[PDB]
């Protein structure tokens, strides 16, 4: 909970970064300039980090509150508060 005996800084590795992230960005497009929504797998796509709103699937299939830990197959996103968007990362793949 709040027990931190020590803190050590280790040098990461490719497999480590693979492990941390939940996606692989592929397009530089930002939020859409017309509909003000993320583009498919863009720099903000909900499929990577999380839903823009809280307890809200992209497609509206499971927009009900009583859903936690359920990934929507129609849109392939998770249902949790907007805070989770603040604590998930993405890794780019280098050629």
Partner 1 sequence: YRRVINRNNRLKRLIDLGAPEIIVNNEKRMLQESVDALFDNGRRGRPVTGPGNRPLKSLSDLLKGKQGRFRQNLLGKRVDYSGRSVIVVGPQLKLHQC
Partner 2 sequence: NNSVPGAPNRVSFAKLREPLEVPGLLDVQTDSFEWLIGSPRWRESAAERGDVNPVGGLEEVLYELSPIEDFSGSMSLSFSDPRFDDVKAPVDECKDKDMTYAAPLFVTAEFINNNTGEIKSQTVFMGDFPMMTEKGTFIINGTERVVVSQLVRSPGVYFDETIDKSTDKTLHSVKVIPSRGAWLEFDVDKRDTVGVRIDRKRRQPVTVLLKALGWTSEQIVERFGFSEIMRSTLEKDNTVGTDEALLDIYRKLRPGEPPTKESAQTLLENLFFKEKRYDLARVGRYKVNKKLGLHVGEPITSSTLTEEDVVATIEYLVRLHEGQTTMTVPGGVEVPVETDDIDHFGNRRLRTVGELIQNQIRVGMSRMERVVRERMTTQDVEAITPQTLINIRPVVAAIKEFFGTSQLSQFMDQNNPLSGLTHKRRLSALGPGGLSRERAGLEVRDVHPSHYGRMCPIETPEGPNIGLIGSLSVYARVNPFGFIETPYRKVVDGVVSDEIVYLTADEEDRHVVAQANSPIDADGRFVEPRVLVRRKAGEVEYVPSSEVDYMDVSPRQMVSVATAMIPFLEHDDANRALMGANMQRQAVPLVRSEAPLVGTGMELRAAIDAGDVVVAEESGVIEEVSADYITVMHDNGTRRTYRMRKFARSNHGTCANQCPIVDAGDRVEAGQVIADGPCTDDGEMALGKNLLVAIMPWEGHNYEDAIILSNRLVEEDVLTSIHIEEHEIDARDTKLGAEEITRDIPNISDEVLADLDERGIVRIGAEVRDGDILVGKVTPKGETELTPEERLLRAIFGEKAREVRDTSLKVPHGESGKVIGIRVFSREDEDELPAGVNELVRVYVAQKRKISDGDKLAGRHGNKGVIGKILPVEDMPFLADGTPVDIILNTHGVPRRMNIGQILETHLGWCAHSGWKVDAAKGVPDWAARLPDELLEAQPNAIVSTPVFDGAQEAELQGLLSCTLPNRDGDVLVDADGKAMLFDGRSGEPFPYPVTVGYMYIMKLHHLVDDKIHARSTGPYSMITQQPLGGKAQFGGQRFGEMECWAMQAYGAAYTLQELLTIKSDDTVGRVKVYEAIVKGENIPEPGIPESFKVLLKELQSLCLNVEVLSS
Length of the chain counted residue by residue: 95
Q: Which residue stretch of 2-10, 27-35, 50-58, 76-84 sits at the interface with partner 1 (rule: CB under 8 A)? A: 27-35
- Rounded Cα gap, residues 95 and 69, in angstroms: 34
Pick between residue 66 and residue 86 the one whose CB is nearest to partner 2: 86
Site string for partner 2, 32-61 (x = CB under 8 A): --xxx-------------------------
- Rounded Cα gap, residues 11 and 19, in angstroms: 14
User: Which of these, 61, 57, 60, 59, lies nearest to 80 by C-alpha position?
Assistant: 57
Q: Which of 19, 20, 27, 37 binds partner 1 (CB under 8 A)?
A: 27
């Amino acid at each position: 909970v709040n027990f931190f005996d020590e803190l050590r800084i280790g040098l990461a590795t490719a497999e480590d970064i693979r492990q941390w992230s939940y996606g692989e960005v592929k397009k530089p497009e930002t939020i859409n300039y017309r509909t003000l929504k993320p583009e498919k797998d863009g720099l903000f796509c909900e499929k990577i980090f999380g839903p823009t709103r809280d307890w809200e699937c992209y497609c509206g299939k499971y927009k009900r509150v009583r859903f936690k830990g359920i990934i929507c197959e129609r849109c392939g996103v998770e249902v949790t508060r907007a805070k989770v968007r603040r604590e998930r990362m993405g890794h780019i793949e280098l050629a």
